[PDB]
Amino acid sequence: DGDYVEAGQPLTRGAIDPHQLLEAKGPEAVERYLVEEIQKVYRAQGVKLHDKH
Amino acid sequence: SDPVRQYL
Amino acid sequence: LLMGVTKSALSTKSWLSAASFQNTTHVLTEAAIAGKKDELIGLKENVILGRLIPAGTGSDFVRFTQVVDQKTLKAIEEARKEA
Amino acid sequence: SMARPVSIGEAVGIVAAQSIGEPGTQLTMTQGLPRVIEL
Amino acid sequence: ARTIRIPVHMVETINKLSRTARQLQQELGREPTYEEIAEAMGPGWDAKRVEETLKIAQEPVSLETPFYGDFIPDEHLP
Amino acid sequence: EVRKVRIALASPEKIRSWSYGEVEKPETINYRTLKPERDGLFDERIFGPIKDYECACGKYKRQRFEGKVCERCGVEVTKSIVRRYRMGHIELATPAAHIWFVK
Amino acid sequence: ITIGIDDAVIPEEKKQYLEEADRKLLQIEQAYEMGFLTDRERYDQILQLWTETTEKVTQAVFKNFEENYPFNPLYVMAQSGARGNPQQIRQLCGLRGLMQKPSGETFEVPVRSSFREGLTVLEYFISSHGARKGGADTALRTADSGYLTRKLVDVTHE
Amino acid sequence: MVQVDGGRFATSDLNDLYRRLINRNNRLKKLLAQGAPEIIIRNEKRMLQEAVDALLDNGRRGAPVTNPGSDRPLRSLTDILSGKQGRFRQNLLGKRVDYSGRSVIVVGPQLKLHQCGLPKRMALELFKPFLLKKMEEKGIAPNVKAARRMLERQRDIKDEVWDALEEVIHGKVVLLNRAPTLHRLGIQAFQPVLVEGQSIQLHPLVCEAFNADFDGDQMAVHVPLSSFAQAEARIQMLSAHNLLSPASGEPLAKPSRDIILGL
Amino acid sequence: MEIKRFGRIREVIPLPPLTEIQVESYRRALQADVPPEKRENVGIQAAFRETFPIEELVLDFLEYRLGEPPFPQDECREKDLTYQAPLYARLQLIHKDTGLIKEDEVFLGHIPLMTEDGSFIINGADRVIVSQIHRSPGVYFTPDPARPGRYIASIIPLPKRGPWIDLEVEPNGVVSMKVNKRKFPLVLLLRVLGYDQETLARELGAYGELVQGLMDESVFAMRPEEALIRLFTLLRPGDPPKRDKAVAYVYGLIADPRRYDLGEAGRYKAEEKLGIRLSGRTLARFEDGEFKDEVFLPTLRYLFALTAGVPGHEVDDIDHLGNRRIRTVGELMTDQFRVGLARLARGVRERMLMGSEDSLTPAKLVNSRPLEAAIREFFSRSQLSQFKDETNPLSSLRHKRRISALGPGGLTRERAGFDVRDVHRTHYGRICPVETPEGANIGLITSLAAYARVDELGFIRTPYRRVVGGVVTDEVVYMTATEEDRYTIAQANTPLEGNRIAAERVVARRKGEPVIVSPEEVEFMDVSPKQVFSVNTNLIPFLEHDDANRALMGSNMQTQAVPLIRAQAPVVMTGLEERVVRDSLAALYAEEDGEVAKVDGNRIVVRYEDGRLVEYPLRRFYRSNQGTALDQRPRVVVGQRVRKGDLLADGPASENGFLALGQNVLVAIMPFDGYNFEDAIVISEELLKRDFYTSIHIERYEIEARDTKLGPERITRDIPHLSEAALRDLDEEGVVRIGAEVKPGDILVGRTSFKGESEPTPEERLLRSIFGEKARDVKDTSLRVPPGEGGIVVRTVRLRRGDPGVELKPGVREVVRVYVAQKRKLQVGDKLANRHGNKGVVAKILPVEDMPHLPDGTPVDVILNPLGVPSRMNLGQILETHLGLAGYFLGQRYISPIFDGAKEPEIKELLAQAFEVYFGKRKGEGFGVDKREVEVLRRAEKLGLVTPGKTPEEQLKELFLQGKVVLYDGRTGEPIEGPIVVGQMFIMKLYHMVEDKMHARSTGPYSLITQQPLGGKAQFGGQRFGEMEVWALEAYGAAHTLQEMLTLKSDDIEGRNAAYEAIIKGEDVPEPSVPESFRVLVKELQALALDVQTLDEKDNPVDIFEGLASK
Amino acid sequence: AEPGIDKLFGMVDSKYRLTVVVAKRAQQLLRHGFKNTVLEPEERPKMQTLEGLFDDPNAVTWAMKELLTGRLVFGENLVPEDRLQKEMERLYPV
DNA sequence: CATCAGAGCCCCAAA
DNA sequence: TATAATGGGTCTGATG
RNA sequence: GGGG
Ligand SMILES: [Mg+2]
Ligand SMILES: [Zn+2]
């Protein structure tokens, strides 16, 4: 309660809609989210996949 | 939408 | 704008690329109406035409490289020294 | 694949797609691939 | 009705062979041989002309029949 | 050298520019001779010779005759490869809408 | 290096860990027939118990190998990364574990046997629902991976 | 419209979609000249439309037209162009190819990293044109067309023929491919080592990239023709030149199974 | 030899006739061995009693009869004919205006007959009709997924005999009805039955939310006929609500036992679920003047009371094996028979109102054709009519007990999800949980459990023994998955002191779920562990020690065991290897007691006790569908006293009556220099010496000589432009002699054909006139051996137009068939496997001197790799080897029942006895212990295998009890540093052999339109370089290698011709031109009115047709 | 691995320019029957026939060996196209 | 809330 | 060529 | 319908 949020910071838990993120926080924010959120899946399986791909 | 039924 | 890979794949400049992917008719009707010229920039475009792809040995950066020995490079140097 | 600066002409895009796709078969548990597709 | 157009009188004869052969089959308990058909067809009909009439009465098969065309080698171009 | 590949709409005029003849009959090939029926879907009069450098009725049968159209049968003497390249056309009584642009 | 049936060394600590579970299990069934615990509470307590038991015998399987049989073929093939992982080795020597119902929820009764001791038909059958579900899943999924790879080649090829 | 073995005829579907249209067009030209009523002409014009639409994209609107006595929709122009079985994907982005074969793969522990075991029987057909020219140049036959007659009966083939093939394949590589090709290392170049027998011999270290074991897997062989194709295969696609994964950067050719067990 | 057998479970009833699911279904469908009066109204009969009578003149059906087959089974296989029977039908044409009756027996064509083993011969090829599994007809209540609180009622009838009807209760509180994708208040339909608002509150009445939420007033204000005309308009926009056009359509849709049919099972199900009696297999009827209801209100009453909490109301599990039923061969065929009988009835009504309404016999009023077609169609084009799998006797036996959920009336590969492929708790005892494909079809194709039997309604039943109090009866009871769910069923191995349950706590099931219960509460006990699995799965010894994923592969690979000439049954069996040979009918037994008269390689003769001398001829070396050689060898000698059911001849893959899919080889589990790597297998060259893993294979080559408009083809010996060396093995006529070795390129049948206007082109005429000879009329078109084929000619068959009893298809003169055999030894590439899922390709064949041998000089046969065991988790092969080790020295074979076999103690006891034979002879034969055996023992001691401080004898025995032995490297003589597991294993040679798969092409056939190479080895095809392989070359940046793949090596007609001429001349390949498949793309776009243009950089069009397309 | 591949990758800025150089030079040799080779007889690649040691027919093998020596110069715009095809057809007849 | 377009690769024998 | 005959027989996601 |  009474905390300080960024424009585009999750308030509920769960996945973020990247289109709501693009409008709120912009291109770089979305590109960061997509790369990290995808990598979270491959790392879980034990797949070393370089980010640049 | 059915040619036979239309002509009939 | 943010598009998924399918919508982004179909929205590309090359109709040869998009037609060969998905929604073949939709891609072709809108292309024909607009009289789209495909510049053959990507790889699928050149694979459909059977051209040397613009990558690897095909890249324009390395495709024109010439080879010549010194016993020959210097044999053509003198014939082009006087007239 | 060579631990050195990439050569000009490398079909980077295609490599990136094969790199992301090949591990795809072994993705169990949106949780798992479905989540990769959702992104 | 035929992808290979047949003169309307020849169609009449092809149909006639058909109605005749079915008649025979229905009073023989089996499919009639070419001889039995030439017999019923009447005078001027030998087994040879029954066979030849069926040979030209054969309608073409589709190349896209699940594909059947994939197994046909092109003989024309060297 | 090829460098671009344009795609656009063919006018009825151009669709006739390509065409080598009008297919007037639904006939395919002759049931006796197995040869292409006249003004049918496989007529050599239109789409070209079936045999390399030879007209239908065999009047001209060699490459000493290239581009000549036989007067008895009306078939050009050229490479029979053109049967893959030569367009024909059907002149419609009334116009019909191209379904791709409707649906 | 060979594989003999005796190389699936059943750790002596197994009998104990089962006994401790059969009694910790009999206490959570008191609370259930005594009304203390609800049905959701019972199921969740039992499942936490046996996954915890499973970890205890997998430790025991590997500790028994390292301390006593450091050159046991199964241990050596797993340790070196030549073949097998802890959970497969656990199924050869310790116990099979808990198996899935067709729906997706766990069975409350676990397969107590290992492949060395040999499963009962009902143990063998209960485990069939899980195997079959993984094969179906592996099949319907291979299709979507391929489709995904094609979209990716198609968006990046240039 | 071609005659098959059995003398029977096999015809493309497009002809029956054209005959459909030409009948309806011709009957319309006749119905117009004969001044038929409105209800008749409009019914004919509708059918003419519906014939044009079965020819360009059969099934899109209304019922798909079908040859009688079979529920198979006829193969319209659209159907030919599109889908996985369509023209683009099945014939332009991927073709079948000459100078290629497949066979069962078998482990070849004795192979150098850049090598594979290629059955001499496969190598003969795959390099057949090369083998003819070499046979004429040595003298094992007098003209290339006689040499091809020699290799046509398995008995007529002599011993010096197999020594000619060895001269032929010298220094040149062949491509090995296992399906599915999930990444570029599904195709790798190899110096072929001629072997008796039927099976292809694979190097144990390349089995991980191919995901090939020996429970029955087969692999495709491909012969790079041109000097350019040979140069690309030997420099860029040689197994020994591709040791690190392109995705992670980690080693791909690396000890596994028995190799690790021994060490 | 001695056959020790383990197991303490006493199996009462034995396995049922394993092919009855086929044999019984069809015999019941046909009833040819039943006198017409006595026929029940089912199958073929029921079809006739549904299509007839025909109401115009009224034609009627009296009886049918089946004749005797025109040709014997062997003669149908031989002549490519269908083994079938003539079908006649006695009909009578009753003129419903005069009363005239002309009767006659009309020929309706032939019906294919099922052979003794439950298979079919369609066009001389054996075929099997795979049973289908589908959702049972009946009423089903399933919960709404969009609306958690409400449910949905569904009324499913038999496939293509009625529409699916759904009764969703829309957001509004009156109940809706969705039929044929329309929707409308069920209120209107209910009025048509004659329902009055009082009978809704009176019959229903209890849910004023629903009983009274359904009754709407605008609908009730109209008579049963007034509403029947309202709904006929709510479902056919266009037809004019006539009161004889509405009662014709609706009656036929819902009340007519000719278009709508709840099956005989659908009746029972709906009766039980709703607790009513259904008079007919149909939802409504037309009685006394109007429509009387039967199902609509019972259903509605149930659906409502299950939006409360009313007893008995429960949703249905549509995957329960009480709600899914099997459609056997009889029902599958009868359904196509009912379809080809309704078309014949259509042509009857069309001839009955045009012709001569009084001049009509039944004969010229019935055209069989639409019935011959439908039947011929089910057997040749159906997805359930499969080319028979007769690789070995077990292949066909498994094929016939297979169950498919796909096909006409079932699912579709893409139409099926997770729910249908799951193992349902009710599969237990009915559908094997292991037997199923790996891959796309997983869970869609399955196998009938061993003791399972399909009942008359089509539900699978499994046997259970009755427990009363604590006494188990020998009484057996077959149950459906619905009956089963009412009982606590104990497990098969529950301890029994005689007929009493010996145990205080017994392991049971209650509605599939596992429960620990006391013997008081036990009602039924399992009959055996065999009743839970398939037949293949029941053939895997030590199954209880194997991972399911690997037991599946071992089940399926048995179907692929090629019959071997020295085949032998496994050393470790499960006790089914005899019933399988018996029921597959590949072997030959004694009909009654008697003595054997003569015995020969061709025939056996048996002087039976009845005096009658019977002569059984023996299938000798007949080609099967997959080309394995089916061959029956004699197993009795002249004068042998044979009792009833005694073995007279072994079938293929049979040894003295036991299934013999492979061989018992001496195996050694140990890495071997890499030739063992990743599942490959190493084998001793000794196996080829004693012709182990050698199998015969027969291939048939066929050629036609037909009439042409250019001349007649001729099967001559006079082939042009040839030499006598090429024709040396051809007879007078031009056919290769029986017994000749043919290799690739060899002529099998000489043939000539005339050429066309290809009548030698001048540069050819000039060549021939130079060489003296003159161009010949005909050309060589003979049948040659294809690449990689060959063998010994064993039979030739000539059939000509004109010879007696033969007539070919139109235009064909003669047809010749040449059968070539090849004795196939094992070779590098051939695939082997055991019953546990261990499969591998022979990678190396070592000479006997390199094989790892035992200390007494015995070399091993096979060298498997231990790395294939831990991850796979198929330890059954490990036990199989240990018990195989004992049997090697004791000279025994064991029967170890599934889940009830030999256990480790027992095995150790045999190994100890065996150690005496392996080592006991040694220590009296004048030999002590070996130096290197001691060295190995020094390392075994460090490995915790042996007890320190015991003599070498006690320590070797300790290793022997663990199955390990001392093993010497054959290349060095030094011992393998450790003791290695060695013993006998049963391994099969699988149908996948390199000789079948090796293929290579330089150039060959191209495809008609694309000009790309044909596919397939049979077409001498090219390999497909698909999308992913192009991606691979792109990723390598191999531009020129790819370009050559897309042009020169495929469809660049210019470049591909020019490339070849450069390579035979020694010139580097030319730069490619345009692929012909792109020109086809351009032209197919012009065909769509689209103008494609290839341009330069100055946007000026570039012609890729080289001027051949413009005028 | 190809003999000295690591040094060849060191000679070029992109690995694909190495393949182009090797391929074009390999073709320069095949068209001129190896007359233009910058190797001495002792350097010449050989293959062991049944008869004996003979020149390696594989021109690509030569191109690489020749490349390592340093007796080959490569680069974009060194000499006009056909000015080169003229004075090499002259120096080494076909 | 309806309509349309997608739904992995290569190989075999059959038809 | 002339009785009369007159209306048929799954599964998800994107876009209007 | 099998293979991987
Ligand atoms: Mg594999
Ligand atoms: Zn002419």
Side-chain angles (χ1 to χ4, degrees), chain H residues 38-84:
Chain H
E38 265 300 283
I39 313 178
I40 282 180
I41 290 297
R42 105 168 39 164
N43 188 31
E44 192 68 27
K45 290 166 69 169
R46 182 184 312 155
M47 286 167 47
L48 194 87
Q49 180 67 317
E50 220 128 354
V52 169
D53 297 340
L55 162 66
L56 296 186
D57 189 23
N58 185 15
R60 185 78 277 271
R61 176 186 134 62
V65 18
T66 69
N67 275 337
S70 121
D71 300 320
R72 182 183 71 85
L74 294 199
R75 197 138 201 274
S76 53
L77 286 181
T78 287
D79 292 331
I80 283 169
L81 263 210
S82 55
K84 181 162 50 180

Side-chain angles (χ1 to χ4, degrees), chain F residues 54-60 69-75 77:
Chain F
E54 182 189 359
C55 65
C57 46
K59 188 182 180 140
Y60 306 86
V69 186
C70 201
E71 332 81 35
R72 185 153 303 147
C73 55
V75 173
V77 277

Side-chain angles (χ1 to χ4, degrees), chain H residues 2-3 5-7 18 56 77-78 80-81 87-107 109-110 119 121-122 125-126 128-130 132-133 136 144 148 152-155 175 177 179-185 187-188 198-199 204 207 213-216 218 220 222-229 232 236-237 242 256-259 261, chain I residues 671 673-680 706 728-729 741-746 827-829 831 839-843 865 867 994-995 997-1004 1006 1008-1010 1012-1015 1020 1022-1030 1032-1033 1035-1041 1044-1046 1048-1051 1060 1063-1066 1068-1069 1075 1077-1078 1080-1081 1084-1085 1087-1088:
Chain H
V2 299
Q3 207 163 18
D5 237 41
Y18 276 139
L56 296 186
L77 286 181
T78 287
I80 283 169
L81 263 210
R87 185 63 76 214
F88 283 115
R89 276 173 82 167
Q90 180 113 33
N91 299 121
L92 289 311
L93 296 176
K95 314 172 156 67
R96 287 190 176 278
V97 280
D98 291 326
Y99 306 118
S100 76
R102 75 179 12 234
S103 182
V104 174
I105 64 176
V106 113
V107 62
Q110 84 294 345
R121 289 298 171 180
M122 294 183 52
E125 183 66 28
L126 288 147
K128 183 104 72 174
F130 302 101
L132 297 177
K133 176 62 191 68
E136 174 189 36
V144 306
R148 190 166 193 80
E152 266 172 2
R153 299 176 81 251
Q154 182 180 96
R155 301 172 180 174
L175 302 183
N177 169 34
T181 301
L182 308 193
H183 52 214
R184 69 189 201 185
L185 296 156
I187 291 188
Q188 302 186 22
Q198 315 282 63
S199 309
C207 287
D213 48 24
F214 302 95
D215 54 20
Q218 299 168 45
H222 281 279
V223 186
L225 296 188
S226 133
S227 292
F228 243 114
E232 301 174 354
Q236 310 162 226
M237 296 176 57
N242 295 263
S256 59
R257 313 299 177 193
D258 310 28
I259 307 180
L261 208 61
Chain I
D673 264 44
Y675 303 105
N676 245 353
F677 189 76
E678 268 304 316
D679 298 332
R706 69 174 202 95
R728 150 202 315 168
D729 287 285
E741 179 176 17
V742 300
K743 299 185 180 303
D746 291 339
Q827 77 170 160
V828 170
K831 189 177 172 194
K839 66 218 207 158
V841 159
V842 174
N865 192 308
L867 294 191
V994 268
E995 198 183 40
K997 310 189 166 181
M998 194 205 63
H999 175 38
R1001 153 188 177 130
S1002 44
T1003 59
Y1006 297 85
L1008 264 168
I1009 305 181
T1010 60
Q1012 285 166 5
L1014 293 188
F1020 196 70
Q1023 294 293 312
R1024 179 159 176 73
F1025 211 93
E1027 280 198 74
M1028 304 173 75
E1029 293 69 30
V1030 177
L1033 295 188
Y1036 276 133
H1040 287 67
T1041 301
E1044 286 198 354
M1045 208 77 54
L1046 301 169
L1048 312 187
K1049 288 163 61 178
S1050 186
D1051 69 20
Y1060 186 99
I1063 300 172
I1064 60 177
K1065 285 188 170 192
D1068 203 65
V1069 296
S1077 246
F1078 178 68
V1080 174
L1081 176 82
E1084 284 174 325
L1085 283 183
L1088 288 153

Side-chain angles (χ1 to χ4, degrees), chain J residues 43-59:
Chain J
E43 308 177 87
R44 295 174 155 244
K46 301 288 186 175
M47 62 175 300
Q48 180 62 1
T49 336
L50 289 171
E51 304 95 19
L53 223 67
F54 267 96
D55 289 320
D56 199 11
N58 187 307

Side-chain angles (χ1 to χ4, degrees), chain I residues 525-602:
Chain I
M525 198 188 79
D526 287 27
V527 84
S528 164
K530 304 196 177 306
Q531 90 179 98
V532 164
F533 307 93
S534 144
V535 164
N536 305 71
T537 288
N538 260 283
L539 289 179
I540 308 184
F542 297 109
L543 174 67
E544 64 263 46
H545 307 280
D546 280 323
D547 188 79
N549 308 78
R550 229 58 197 197
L552 174 155
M553 306 174 63
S555 244
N556 295 332
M557 288 185 295
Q558 279 178 109
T559 307
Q560 313 170 29
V562 166
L564 310 134
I565 76 185
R566 289 290 305 284
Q568 49 188 150
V571 289
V572 185
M573 307 182 316
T574 74
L576 267 77
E577 3 273 315
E578 273 167 304
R579 266 300 303 267
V580 167
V581 165
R582 250 280 184 69
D583 278 19
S584 76
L585 290 185
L588 173 54
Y589 306 90
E591 210 168 344
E592 226 83 45
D593 319 55
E595 174 186 324
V596 185
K598 304 199 126 66
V599 176
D600 186 19
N602 291 328

Side-chain angles (χ1 to χ4, degrees), chain H residues 197-209:
Chain H
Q198 315 282 63
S199 309
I200 292 177
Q201 291 179 21
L202 200 68
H203 194 299
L205 287 182
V206 296
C207 287
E208 178 177 343

Side-chain angles (χ1 to χ4, degrees), chain I residues 455-486:
Chain I
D455 72 335
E456 305 183 42
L457 291 198
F459 299 100
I460 308 180
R461 311 177 91 103
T462 194
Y464 287 119
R465 280 212 270 173
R466 186 177 295 288
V467 164
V468 193
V471 185
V472 169
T473 317
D474 292 277
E475 168 182 354
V476 177
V477 168
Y478 279 83
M479 294 179 167
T480 58
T482 313
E483 217 171 301
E484 177 189 286
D485 271 356
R486 301 179 67 214

Side-chain angles (χ1 to χ4, degrees), chain I residues 706-766:
Chain I
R706 69 174 202 95
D707 281 312
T708 324
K709 297 181 180 295
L710 282 66
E713 290 179 340
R714 293 203 198 83
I715 301 305
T716 178
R717 187 189 196 267
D718 194 272
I719 294 154
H721 291 267
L722 280 193
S723 51
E724 184 51 71
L727 315 165
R728 150 202 315 168
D729 287 285
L730 303 187
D731 61 26
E732 279 62 6
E733 297 184 0
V735 169
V736 62
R737 72 161 175 89
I738 284 187
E741 179 176 17
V742 300
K743 299 185 180 303
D746 291 339
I747 289 182
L748 298 168
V749 180
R751 191 181 74 185
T752 45
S753 293
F754 309 89
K755 26 169 117 27
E757 279 145 277
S758 159
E759 278 268 353
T761 94
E763 359 183 314
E764 270 118 7
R765 299 187 180 144
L766 182 54

